[PDB]
Write a protein that holds these residues in place. Structure first.
Motif, PDB file in Angstrom:
ATOM      1  N   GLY A 181      52.129  56.055  61.740  1.00 35.52           N
ATOM      2  CA  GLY A 181      50.711  55.771  62.041  1.00 35.52           C
ATOM      3  C   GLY A 181      50.470  55.514  63.526  1.00 35.52           C
ATOM      4  O   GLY A 181      51.300  55.940  64.337  1.00 35.52           O
TER       5      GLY A 181
ATOM      6  N   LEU B   2      49.049  63.369  65.402  1.00 36.42           N
ATOM      7  CA  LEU B   2      49.879  62.327  64.734  1.00 36.42           C
ATOM      8  C   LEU B   2      50.620  62.988  63.573  1.00 36.42           C
ATOM      9  O   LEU B   2      50.051  63.939  63.016  1.00 36.42           O
ATOM     10  CB  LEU B   2      48.990  61.215  64.169  1.00 36.42           C
TER      11      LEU B   2
ATOM     12  N   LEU C  87      52.493  61.592  60.013  1.00 29.36           N
ATOM     13  CA  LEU C  87      52.905  60.596  58.997  1.00 29.36           C
ATOM     14  C   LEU C  87      54.101  61.169  58.234  1.00 29.36           C
ATOM     15  O   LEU C  87      54.072  62.400  57.969  1.00 29.36           O
ATOM     16  CB  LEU C  87      51.706  60.351  58.051  1.00 29.36           C
TER      17      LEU C  87
ATOM     18  N   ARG D 130      43.436  58.388  51.786  1.00 26.46           N
ATOM     19  CA  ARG D 130      43.020  57.546  52.918  1.00 26.46           C
ATOM     20  C   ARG D 130      41.744  56.785  52.542  1.00 26.46           C
ATOM     21  O   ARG D 130      40.947  57.246  51.686  1.00 26.46           O
ATOM     22  CB  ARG D 130      42.815  58.385  54.165  1.00 26.46           C
TER      23      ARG D 130
ATOM     24  N   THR E  10      39.864  58.070  61.126  1.00 24.75           N
ATOM     25  CA  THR E  10      40.283  56.647  61.240  1.00 24.75           C
ATOM     26  C   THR E  10      40.315  56.031  59.848  1.00 24.75           C
ATOM     27  O   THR E  10      39.257  55.993  59.232  1.00 24.75           O
ATOM     28  CB  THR E  10      39.352  55.873  62.187  1.00 24.75           C
TER      29      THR E  10
ATOM     30  N   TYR F 166      46.096  55.333  55.501  1.00 23.04           N
ATOM     31  CA  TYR F 166      46.607  56.492  54.727  1.00 23.04           C
ATOM     32  C   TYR F 166      47.667  55.966  53.781  1.00 23.04           C
ATOM     33  O   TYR F 166      48.570  55.255  54.260  1.00 23.04           O
ATOM     34  CB  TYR F 166      47.171  57.557  55.669  1.00 23.04           C
TER      35      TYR F 166
ATOM     36  N   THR G 182      49.589  53.032  55.830  1.00 16.91           N
ATOM     37  CA  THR G 182      49.819  52.967  57.298  1.00 16.91           C
ATOM     38  C   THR G 182      48.506  53.310  58.010  1.00 16.91           C
ATOM     39  O   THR G 182      47.904  54.329  57.653  1.00 16.91           O
ATOM     40  CB  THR G 182      50.993  53.870  57.709  1.00 16.91           C
ATOM     41  N   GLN G 183      48.090  52.474  58.954  1.00 15.14           N
ATOM     42  CA  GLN G 183      46.851  52.593  59.771  1.00 15.14           C
ATOM     43  C   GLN G 183      46.964  53.781  60.735  1.00 15.14           C
ATOM     44  O   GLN G 183      47.975  53.938  61.414  1.00 15.14           O
ATOM     45  CB  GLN G 183      46.559  51.327  60.574  1.00 15.14           C
ATOM     46  N   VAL G 184      45.906  54.590  60.753  1.00 14.35           N
ATOM     47  CA  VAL G 184      45.687  55.718  61.693  1.00 14.35           C
ATOM     48  C   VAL G 184      44.334  55.460  62.368  1.00 14.35           C
ATOM     49  O   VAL G 184      43.324  55.331  61.608  1.00 14.35           O
ATOM     50  CB  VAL G 184      45.738  57.050  60.922  1.00 14.35           C
TER      51      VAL G 184
END
Length: 120
Positions: free
Chosen positions: A8, A17, A19, A37, A90, A93, A114-116
């Motif tokens: 993330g 990015l 994952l 997400r 944003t 996920y 996990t934060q994106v």
């Protein structure tokens, strides 16, 4: 059984990015793995999935063209390469692994998420 998420973080709009999800203890008969997400205060929505079985793929329309989902069979790890990112992407996920046999959903595991973060 464990689904472990990684990769993330924060990134600028138009960036890239990746994952990963490592899946321990899930049978690979005809496993299906995929990413959801959730943005703050919004419903959790489907993003992409692969049949481990083969490596057939499917995307939400909002993500089609931009994101690529892949499987490394020997590592029991799935990837979501996220390209051409926008601020709408944003979210937290979550990773998911399921098998459906006779229209019966036999198992359904989820990672912790996990934060994106994509900034303007």
């Amino acid at each position: 059984v464990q689904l472990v998420e990684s990769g993330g973080g924060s990134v600028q709009a138009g960036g890239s990015l990746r994952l990963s999800c490592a899946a321990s203890g899930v049978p690979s008969s005809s496993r299906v793995m995929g990413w959801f997400r959730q943005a703050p205060g919004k419903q959790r929505e489907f993003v992409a999935a692969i049949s481990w079985t083969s490596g057939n793929v499917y995307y939400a329309d909002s993500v089609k063209g931009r994101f690529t989902i892949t499987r490394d069979n020997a590592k029991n790890t799935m990837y979501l390469q996220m390209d051409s990112l926008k601020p709408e992407d944003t979210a937290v996920y979550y990773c998911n692994a399921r098998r459906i046999r006779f229209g019966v959903r036999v198992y359904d595991y989820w990672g912790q998420g996990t934060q994106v973060t994509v900034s303007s």
